[PDB]
Every structure is written in C-alpha cells, then in structure tokens.
Design a protein around this ligand. Structure first.
Ligand code: DTP
Ligand code: DTP
Ligand code: FE2
Ligand code: FE2
Ligand code: MG
Ligand code: MG
Lengths: 563, 563
C-alpha cells in the first residue's frame, strides 16, 4: 500500500472517481453513495472504457500468431515457451481490464505444445543414439512440463499488473484424457502441492478449478480418477482446486462444453457466432452493479414492522435503478476504438481481431458479452421479511433481467457478487441509518448472496443441499463452500462432499484450515490466539515463521491481517 | 497513448505535477517553466520519493535468495530460470523508479547458472548412457543458453512496467573469457542478430553495451576477438551493441572494473563500503536537473551583443539555482521508509537489505549514490559566445559540483543529458523569447551536450577526436556517436572507428541505417520520401511492410513517427 505502483494506481483512482462523479447521473451516484446499490469499479469505469473479466482465447493467439508488446509472437515450438507467453498474456490482460482473467482448459489448449516438446526429445534420443527411445522422451517431456507449469505458477506471483499487483488469474482443467492433457493436469497439481517458494507456502493465485465428470474424473474406474486423487490431496493441502460439476454446469449454462468462470465466478451463457458455433473463449463481462437486498427490506419497514407492499414497491423501483446504472456504463462504451487495448481487441485475447479504428462496443452486443446484476445477503433479507423468499426473489429478478436483455440486446444475468469487501460496506452504510438491527446489521456484515449463514449449524451435505438450487437460479455467477477440519489424511471424506456436491450443484469449493509452521514444520491447524496463531506442537507464534491461509470470503489470505 | 495503462499513468502524472507545483519552491518551478533549467521527471518526483536509475545487484539477489512479489525465490538451478527471474526483476525495478535499469556483466553474473545447466546435462548423458558425454552436454547447454537469452530478449519486450511500457533496460558484457561467459556473449549477440519476432525486427530494448579491452576483445590474437567479430556483425545489423573502452572507462571512473552505465549513460564514480570494497552493483542515481547553457548566453546579451560579464553573472547564479533544485528533491527523500519499494530496498536490487522501517535516504549518502547536473547545447553556446568554451565551462562546472559534494556529502557529477525530448523544448522555450536566432534556435533544436553539430561535416575519426576530451570532463554521463552508411559488409571499416574510439574515448556508439523490407527482404537503406521510406529494390512503401530503425537522438526508433 505504500509501494509505488500502488500509490500511482491510487492517484488514477482518485481522478477516476472524480470523473465518475461527473459522468454518472446524480441519482445513480446518490444510490451508490448510500448503499441502496453498489456500482463496482467506480475507480476505473466509466472514467475510461474498461471492461470487467474474461476467458482469454489462448488457443487462438498461440495457434495463429499475435503481437504482444513489441514482439510479433509465433506459435510456441515448446511447452515451456507457451506457459511463458501465457504468463505474459496474463499480465497484459490483467492490465487492460479491472476484473479477473481466466485461461480455460489449459490441459487441452496447451496439449499441442507438450506434443512438441516430446517430438523434439524423440528426435534427440534418435540423434544421439540413446538406449531408451520412448523412455528418454517420456522422462524429459515429463520434466519439461513440470518446469513449464512451475514457471507459470511463479511468474503469476512475480509479474505485476499495471496497478502494482499480482494478476487475479484463474486456470481450469480436467476434461482431457490424452496423455499430454493428463500430463498438464498432474503438472499443475504437483506444483501447487509443492508450495510457492523456499517455504512452499500456499499461493493465493492462480486459482485452480478442475471439472469433475462421470466417465473421466469421479469414479474408481474412470481414466483420470487417479488425477482426482492427486486433486483431493492438493485441495487438502492448499484449498484449491475448486471443482465444477460438468453435468450441472452444462445444464445451467446451456453450453455443450463445461463453462469456466471468468475470474472468481462469473459464468457465461451459451452463445453462437454467425456461422452457428458455440463460442466460449474470448468472451467477457461488461460489469457489475450489486443490489443491497437487505436494505430493500429495511427501507420498507413501517415502524418496527415489515410492510410487504412497500417492499414490492421499492423492489421494482430499485430493479429499474440497477438497470439504469448498468446501462450507464455500457453506454460510456460507445465511440471507444480498439486502439484502447490492443491485446484484447486486435490480437487474440477477445477471440476476434478488430481493426484499430473499429468501435469496441459492437463486439459485446447481442449476447456475446454478459452483464451483471449482483445481489447479496439473501439470509438477512429472509430474517427481515420473516420467511425464506430467496429462491423466489432471485427468480422475480431473472424475470426483469430477461426483459432487459430483450430490450437492450445485452445478455444480463444474476450474479452472486463475491463481495469480499461489499459484505462490510453495505452493512456499515445500513447500520448508519438503522443502528444495530438484531441478526442483520448487528454482526457487522451480510452473508454472501444465497449462502447459508455461517453462524448456522448444518451438515456439509445439508448446506450444499440448501444452496444447490441457487446454482440454477443465479446463473450469472455462483459458488458454494462448506467448512471441514483438517482433511490432509481423510481424502475419502473430503471426496465425499466433492462427490455429493458435484451431483447437486455447479461450482464448488471446500475450505478447511491450511497452515504451516516454518520453525517446526507442522501442517496442523494453528490454534488461534487473542494475538494470532500459535503452533500447537512447537509453540511458535511469530507470524513470519508460518504461513496461515483461510478462505474466509472469496479469496484465500492470512487472517492475521485484519481486525 | 490511448492504451489503458498509459491513460492511467497520465492521470498519476497530472496529479504528480500538481503536487510538485505545491512542493517545489516557486522560484525553481518558475525557472523550469521558462527553460532556464529543467527539472526532469516532475511527473514522478517529488510527489512520491522515486529515484532515477541504477545497476541492479543481480549477483546478490540470485546468489542469496530474495522475495519478488509473493515468491521467496531461491538460487536458480538452471540458466533459463535465471534469465526469467532477471526479466521479472527488470519489470519490478522499472516499476519502482522513473529511470533506466541496468544489469551489468550478465556474462559473469549469469555464468554460474550455465555451469549448472551443464552439470545437469553431464549427469544426464551419464544417466541415459549416452555415446558422447562431453559432447551431449556441450550441445544441450549451448542450446539451453541461446533459448535463455531469447526468452529474456522477448520478455523485456512483452513485459510491461506499471506505466504501461516496456522496461528501459540495459545489459552489458564483454569482460569474461571463461567458456560459460563467452557462451552468454555469443548467446546475446546471435539472438539480437536474429531479430525480434516473426519478422526479426530490430528491438529497441534491451540496449547492448560490450566492453572492449586489450587482451580480451580487440586484437586479432585476444581470446574473445571472435566475439568482437560477431559483435561488429550484430551492430551493423541492429545498431547495438554500443562499446565502452575499458581502459578509459576505468581511468575516468576510478573503478578497478569497467563501470556499466545506469540506463542510457549515467556513470557512477568509484566508491567503497565500510570494509573498503569497491561497490558498483546496487548503486543508483538520485535524479537530474539540466541547465540550458545556450539560454544563459542569450539571456546575457545586451542588445545584439554578447556581454561576457553578464554571462559570468548569470552562470554563477544559475549554477546555484540548479543546486537548490537538486537539493530540493533529495530532501523530499527524508522520512521515506523502505516499505516504499521492497525489491529495491529490502530484497537484493540496491545491494543491501534494509528493514522495512529504515529510512531510505541514508543508503544514498556519502557518495554511494550519484546526482546529476545536466547540460546541453555546447555547440549553440559556442556560437552565442563566439568561441569554443565547451571544454572549459564544463570544467568551471565540475568545480561547483565538487564544492556541492563537499558541502552536502552527495556525489554530484556532470551529466550530458540524453535529451531525446529536451533538445526541442529548450529551443522552443527560448525561441518564445528570442525568436529565430541564426544557427541557434533557428534549426528548432539544440545539439546534445558536447556533441559536434550534425550540420557540421567532419570525419568519423575527426568527430570522435573533437569529442573524446569531454568523456573525461562530463564524468557523470557521456557518449559519442558517429554516422556511417550501411556497413553490413564492411565490418573492417566499422571496426576501424570502434578501434579508434575505444582508444580515445569512453562510451561509444555508431549509428548507421538499419532497415528491412518485409515484402522483398532488403537489408538496404530505404530511400526517404516526402512521405516515408521506399524500398529501392522492390518499390515497397507501405510502412507496415518494413521495419526502419534510426538512432536520431538517444534511442532507436522508426523515424516515420515524427514530423
Ligand atoms: N520461471 C520461473 N520464473 C520465476 N521464478 C522461478 C521460475 N522457475 C522457478 N522459479 C523459482 C522457484 C525457486 O525459488 C527457484 C527454482 O529454480 P529452479 O530450481 O531452476 O526451478 P525448477 O524447479 O524448474 O528446477 P529444478 O527441478 O532443477 O530444481 O526459482
Ligand atoms: N520466453 C519467451 N517469452 C516470450 N516469447 C518467447 C519466448 N521464447 C520465445 N518466444 C517467442 C519468439 C517466437 O515468436 C516464438 C518462439 O517460440 P519457440 O520457437 O519455442 O522459441 P525458441 O527459439 O526458444 O525455440 P526453437 O529454437 O525450438 O524454435 O515465441
Ligand atoms: Fe511450530
Ligand atoms: Fe522491398
Ligand atoms: Mg523458435
Ligand atoms: Mg527447483
């Protein structure tokens, strides 16, 4: 935060909010200022025409050529070089949009390049007359690939985005059986288990999402079932990888192939080009405006009594407000040329190649890009109205969303905002007006989207069952977590929730304690002190002598830096 | 320029100049505003405590460990990984200072890591029972190293600094004979000749400076004389590498080892630590304030007549002004903690490891860091005063500089400002007051530092001879160029100027036409049109179908983007 690149970003942030204050209609800013809604990234958009997140079309760029910076890159002739260009792209893309960036199916996209490192090695055992032909190659290739993903793993943690930060990047895999594809998968997983750096700590990025599917990943007999096992190990030691149910995913998205989340959890919906092809990679999201659901209910109290009709009034009113807010920023996009971000619009990233002087707004119309109507705190809302209305209000929302899509041509969808930050702001702005409302603003924060309350006491299986239906309503983005104790040696139980989840819902992640004592090397849950974590079996307390990760909200982090 | 990262940098720039307007004493800003002096980087410093340029202590970082971003890196066990960490460091450092960044003697620093790629390969020909032991290794290692520097070459052109730009980076080599050291040298050189990207164009960065020295690089019998030959080829095809006379360099700097330039041409002077060791790597420069020499003379005209005494008055007056300006920004550095730029002050970069809460100002005191008093236009000055006073005014300047050093403890030195940009601004600000003064402001720009006028008509040998003495007066930074026609096949003549130069001066570069037609593949000087370059032997004119580089001022660039 005192670091230079950050100071600089901050400057551009202050200037941006200032310009926003002037571009955004007074009534929308007012609502944002007071917590009715929340216009995300007001420190980037609409001051400059940034977009949000995306699925980089890596196959397109690496396949054909592309210019990156000053280099007109050619197709990689080796695996290591591809995961380099990828780490470089990760950085450039992170610097031309204010949202997460995702490389979907690296196992399948990067496969060709393993097949080249192999070719190269076979032609080498054959040049130097080596005993084992097919055996040299295997080995060398297995290594080249581990190193290649160890490079990526590190480069994502050493390369900075223009705002002076590590790229928020997501890598997905799992639907590949070819030997090269399987090789990348174990490559990614072994590296993560290994840990980042000298002390093999749990990296916070890149996120790892593995698709699990019947006949590939989840049954004792399926081909990559061994991979599932390494995956369970990995997750029990570093949280990631999260898993996505290929079955429910396809069903919910409408795509014939599993849809990877752009960033944390923004899902695209199936879309086709002029020639009728389902396009996934290269597509993106235009932004997010989150609706403070609790605040709708609170604002519609008469005295200390909830008034149902008042709710129906403000709801419809705030629904329109949100549409006006989203449409505001989308319009700011008119006139903007491709000159604004070459790797996105001119070279491969967004899946097309626009001329410099082309408008960028057309590339997003008619459903290619998605737009987010975010919500939060279904729990506190229920408490305020007196009954679970979650499944249904979210549904009254898709209804509006559908009308919007039809009137504007933009593909709007229900997004369950991660709100690592918003969970506090809204509560705080609401507390400012309503004081400490029991069970609502009292705890200090709101529960994520449709998640069960933490303070509730259910069974992992019961929790996923209570949430699963939402994975089908809030299609724009969604995820479910369940808390388990150390599972390092109980992978069967861990695999039991994964299995149950992969059946009933879509995007799933299980977060359990992942700690490491540097002095004593204890992979056991440190016990919390009124002053941090303490090593049970070595008494270690100095924070610098340990790595303590916990996914308290959306990302992982050391909970000893917050209070 | 419409590109996002740049828009953002711009915002932070406007905010920074604004804050400077408030921090910098009115009289200094006034002088800057009017062209008497020129406070460089007012868009970074003093708004934030940035520093200028430096020699990264890569040996220190790679040797011991170091944290970069989130990764606690360990010593490279392979050559490719070292030139990766280097490309990553290049980026991080470029993002914590507003000046060039240099990696001195990559041949010697990176040597160990070639010796490891070799070890690894020998142990492999020995594991797979390969025919040629020492021969497999050689080959594999020779390749690993070419690839390693081809990665660096590219990564410097694809990685961005926080301001949305390719790092201004300099790589030096040449004083190494070990086989590994020689290997890096040819590695660097072959890659450059190869060209950047699909169309093998002349990269603009990283700059290449090779030290040439008797008994190593420049005589038919010396060991790396073959390298000199590849070097001459390289330079004739891509401008770089520039050369530095190890003999005169040591002499001028006082260092026992050739001193590499921080950035374009900022030379350090020999300095020692508490234990009496000459330290080079890790040292840096605090900044630059350039004095408009011509403007001193013009301002000291009485009517249309130059008045000598008036000159002596303003000169002494402006000399003090410059000192007050430099001291201004240096003071802004008091209080600043190491938390401001970890890779520089906490991890290896600046050669020491400060605690977070340590002040950074102490690290620069008592001569470790240099400070720049820049000057420009010795030619126009001569014309205004009526006689060459260059060698001597620069000398009256070192005198002041020496007093400053003694009063402040900071190591001030005469810097011959590159002024790729300033060469026009000063002239323009002066023209604003004196109209079009014959031979001075009339041409539109001022001649760099002590360089002979372009419009003059001398012999390469005569030009270097007229400049050489300045390489010994303006010790803070200096360089000489000479213009030659295509030399692609005349390396002996090219080597003749290099040889003559390496004898009489210090930092040398020869710029000749380096063009390439993409449609016809003609490495011949395109002939200039009132509308760009035209291919002689293929008539090609479309700019996109060619790469036309020319070092018109300090950097190389396509002269078809300016007018
Ligand atoms: N491509 C990379 N970019 C940045 N840091 C890297 C990269 N690859 C590895 N590192 C980090 C991790 C460790 O601190 C150290 C490892 O170097 P190195 O041992 O060469 O890696 P490696 O695992 O590919 O090789 P090996 O298996 O030979 O040890 O550098
Ligand atoms: N480390 C790197 N980072 C970014 N781009 C790179 C890197 N290495 C090479 N490139 C670019 C240059 C070309 O457009 C293309 C070359 O890929 P590749 O052919 O694998 O390089 P190479 O020269 O190391 O291998 P080879 O000798 O096998 O061709 O990618
Ligand atoms: Fe411990
Ligand atoms: Fe041509
Ligand atoms: Mg190649
Ligand atoms: Mg290693």
């Amino acid at each position: 935060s005192r670091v230079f690149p950050t100071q600089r970003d901050l400057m551009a942030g202050i200037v941006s909010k200032h310009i926003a204050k002037n571009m955004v209609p007074s009534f929308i800013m007012k609502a944002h200022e007071s917590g009715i809604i929340h216009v995300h990234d007001i420190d980037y958009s609409p001051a400059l025409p940034f977009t949000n997140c995306c699925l980089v079309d890596l196959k397109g760029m690496l396949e054909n050529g592309f210019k990156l910076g000053n280099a007109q890159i050619e197709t990689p002739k080796s695996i290591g070089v591809a995961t380099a260009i990828m780490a470089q792209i990760t950085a450039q893309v992170a610097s031309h949009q204010y949202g997460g960036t995702t490389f979907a199916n690296v196992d399948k996209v990067l496969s060709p390049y393993v097949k080249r490192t192999y070719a190269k090695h076979i032609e080498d055992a054959e040049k130097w007359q080596i005993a084992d032909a097919l055996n040299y190659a295997q080995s060398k290739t297995e290594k080249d690939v581990y190193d290649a993903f160890q490079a990526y793993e590190y480069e994502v943690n050493t390369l900075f985005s223009s705002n002076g930060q590590t790229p928020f990047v997501t890598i997905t895999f799992g639907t590949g059986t070819d030997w090269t594809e399987r090789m990348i998968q174990k490559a990614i997983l072994k590296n993560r288990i290994k840990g980042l750096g000298r002390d093999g700590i749990t990296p916070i990025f890149p996120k790892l999402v593995m698709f699990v599917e019947e006949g590939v990943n989840l049954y004792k007999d399926d081909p990559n079932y061994d991979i599932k096992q390494l995956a369970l190990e990995c997750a029990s030691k570093r949280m990631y990888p999260d898993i996505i149910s290929a079955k429910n995913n396809k069903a919910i998205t409408g795509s014939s192939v599993p849809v990877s989340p752009m960033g944390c959890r923004s899902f695209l919906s199936v879309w086709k080009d002029s020639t009728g092809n389902e396009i996934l990679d290269g597509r993106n999201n235009l932004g997010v405006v989150t609706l403070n659901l609790p605040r709708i209910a609170l604002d519609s109290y008469i005295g200390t009594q909830f008034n149902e009709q008042k709710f129906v009034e403000l709801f419809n009113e705030r629904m329109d407000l949100c549409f006006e807010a989203l449409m505001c920023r989308i319009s700011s996009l008119k006139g903007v040329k491709a000159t604004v971000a070459p790797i996105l619009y001119q070279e491969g990233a967004f899946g097309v190649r626009l001329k410099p002087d082309d408008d960028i707004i057309e590339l997003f119309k008619n459903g290619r890009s998605s737009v987010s109507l975010g919500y939060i705190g279904i729990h506190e809302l229920n408490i305020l109205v007196g009954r679970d209305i979650g499944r249904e209000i979210l549904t009254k929302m898709n209804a509006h969303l559908k009308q919007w899509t039809e009137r504007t041509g933009f593909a709007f969808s229900l997004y369950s905002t991660p709100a690592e930050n918003l969970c506090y702001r809204f509560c705080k702005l609401d507390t400012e007006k309503y004081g400490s409302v029991k069970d609502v603003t009292d705890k200090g924060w709101y529960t994520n989207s449709f998640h069960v309350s933490v303070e509730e006491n259910i069974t992992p299986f019961e929790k996923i069952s209570r949430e699963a239906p939402y994975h089908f309503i809030a299609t724009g983005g969604h995820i479910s977590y369940v808390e388990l104790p150390d599972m390092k040696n109980n992978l069967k139980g861990l695999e039991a929730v994964w299995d149950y989840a992969a059946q009933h819902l879509d995007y799933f992640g299980v977060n359990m304690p992942v700690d490491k004592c540097f002095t004593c090397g204890s992979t056991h849950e440190m016990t919390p002190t009124e002053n941090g974590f303490v090593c049970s079996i070595c008494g270690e307390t100095d924070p610098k002598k340990m790595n303590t990760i916990r996914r308290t909200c959306a990302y992982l982090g050391n909970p000893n830096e917050r209070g």
